[PDB]
Write a protein that holds these residues in place. Structure first.
Motif, PDB file in Angstrom:
ATOM      1  N   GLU A 280       0.822  -1.201   0.000  1.00  0.00           N
ATOM      2  CA  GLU A 280       0.000   0.000   0.000  1.00  0.00           C
ATOM      3  C   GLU A 280       0.856   1.251   0.000  1.00  0.00           C
ATOM      4  N   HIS A 281       1.832   1.290   0.897  1.00  0.00           N
ATOM      5  CA  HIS A 281       2.535   2.522   1.222  1.00  0.00           C
ATOM      6  C   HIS A 281       3.744   2.829   0.341  1.00  0.00           C
TER       7      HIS A 281
ATOM      8  N   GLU B 224       4.119   4.620  -2.093  1.00  0.00           N
ATOM      9  CA  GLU B 224       4.234   6.039  -2.384  1.00  0.00           C
ATOM     10  C   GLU B 224       5.063   6.746  -1.334  1.00  0.00           C
ATOM     11  N   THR B 225       4.756   6.474  -0.072  1.00  0.00           N
ATOM     12  CA  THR B 225       5.415   7.125   1.050  1.00  0.00           C
ATOM     13  C   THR B 225       6.896   6.770   1.122  1.00  0.00           C
TER      14      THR B 225
HETATM   15 NA    NA Z   1       0.820   5.780   1.454  1.00  0.00          NA
END
Ligand code: NA
Ligand code: NA
Ligand SMILES: [Zn+2]
Length: 264
Positions: free
Chosen positions: A126-127, A129-130
């Motif tokens: 999910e993450h 991007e971060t």
């Molecule tokens: Na994220």
């Protein structure tokens, strides 16, 4: 989520670099038994704390030698064990044995941040991007540190330095400098004292003014080098312990990069 991913971490450059990649997302803690990464061997407790985490992150098979041999799928665990320098090409102990001390070269801290994000972003899809943007800034302010400093070390005032153990081999090389460690790649590879006699004259030949110790008390063998021929003692952090303070990782790298360059 209301927790994050529970993440255990070998020592500081790893602590700091996973934390920088995660921002505010995960529960990032450090194996923080304390002692010294080169000679350290995890207690039954730390082992169980690893097997208990969701993710465990170490530097390299050539440093944290236990890690390979951690067996989550046998000891009924579900840890993602992540070698953060995996693939990164390490220079051989000069003249089997390899120098792990990458993290001190701004570029190479950068590449290791990436690997971290990649492996983190496959494990916790999910993450992605971060992670990729946290790493992205990191590598950016690392390439900038190399830029600020390349001229500093260019102007020289001659080259050579001597440090408490052989940690700065990657820094030095990225900057045209050459180093000498009192000890080998690990602090417990202490001189001889035939080696001591050579390094003694190296200080003279290359005309060196400051031996760079750490806090990390275990070098009397340095102290007793001012306390022989020559003069001058200053402390230089290989970032193996954490200084805590507030400072970022790159902020601490840079700070010791100050000290070394100012010495010219
Ligand atoms: Na994220
Ligand atoms: Na694994
Ligand atoms: Zn070291």
């Amino acid at each position: 989520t209301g927790k994050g991913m529970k993440i255990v971490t070998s020592f500081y450059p790893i602590y700091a670099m996973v934390k920088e990649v995660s921002g505010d997302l995960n529960d990032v803690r450090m194996i923080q038994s304390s002692s010294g990464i080169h000679s350290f061997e995890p207690s039954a407790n730390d082992i169980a704390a690893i097997y208990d985490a969701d993710v465990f992150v170490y530097h390299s098979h050539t440093l944290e030698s236990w890690a390979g041999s951690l067996d989550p799928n046998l000891k009924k665990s579900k840890v993602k064990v992540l070698e953060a320098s995996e693939g990164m090409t390490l220079e051989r102990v000069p003249g089997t044995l390899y120098d792990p001390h990458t993290w001190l070269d701004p570029e190479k801290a950068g590449e290791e941040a990436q690997i971290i994000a990649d492996k983190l972003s496959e494990v916790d899809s999910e993450h992605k991007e971060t992670y990729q943007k946290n790493a992205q800034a990191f590598i950016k302010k690392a390439q900038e540190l190399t830029k600020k400093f390349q001229p500093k070390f260019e102007k020289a005032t001659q080259k050579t330095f001597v440090t408490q153990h052989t940690a700065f081999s990657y820094l030095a090389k990225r900057f045209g400098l050459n180093q000498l460690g009192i000890a080998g790649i690990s602090p417990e590879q202490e001189p001889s004292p035939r080696q001591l006699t050579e390094i003694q004259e190296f200080v003279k030949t290359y005309k060196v003014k400051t031996i760079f110790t750490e806090s990390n008390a275990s070098s009397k063998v340095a102290e007793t080098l001012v306390k022989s021929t020559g003069v001058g003692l200053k402390t230089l952090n290989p970032l193996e312990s954490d200084p805590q303070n507030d400072k970022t990782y790159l902020e601490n790298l840079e700070e010791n990069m100050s000290i070394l360059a100012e010495e010219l």
